[PDB]
Amino acid sequence: QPTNGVGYQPYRVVVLSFELLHAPATVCGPKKSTNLVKNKCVNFNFNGLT
Amino acid sequence: AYTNSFTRGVYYPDKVFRSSVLHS
């Protein structure tokens, strides 16, 4: 009821669970991709592994 | 009614590539 005390009110809940496996990514962050480079020393990120 | 499994039923424990290693 709207008259309930603060703890006795309803609350909505969401729980987000991450399948953070060493496997193909399918949900990823709001981020770009460069061209690939070979035979040169470079800093790199693949799917958030750096 | 029975038969014996021998060395059946091993499976890949994780989605990682490895080579020439005695993993445990």
Note the resolution in Å, 1 decimal: 3.5
Angle, vertex CA A47, rays to CA B11 and CA A29, nearest 5: 125
Min Cα distance A37 → chain B (Å) is 23
Best residue in B12, B15, B17, B23 for a mutation probing chain A (most A CBs within 10 Å): B15
Nearest to A48 by CA among A26, A21, A18, A28: A28
Shortest Cα distance, chain A CAs vs residue B7, angstroms = 28
Cα radius of gyration rounded to whole Å, chain A = 22
Query: In three state form, how does the secondary structure of chain B look?
Result: CCCCCCCCCCCCCCCCCCCCCCCC
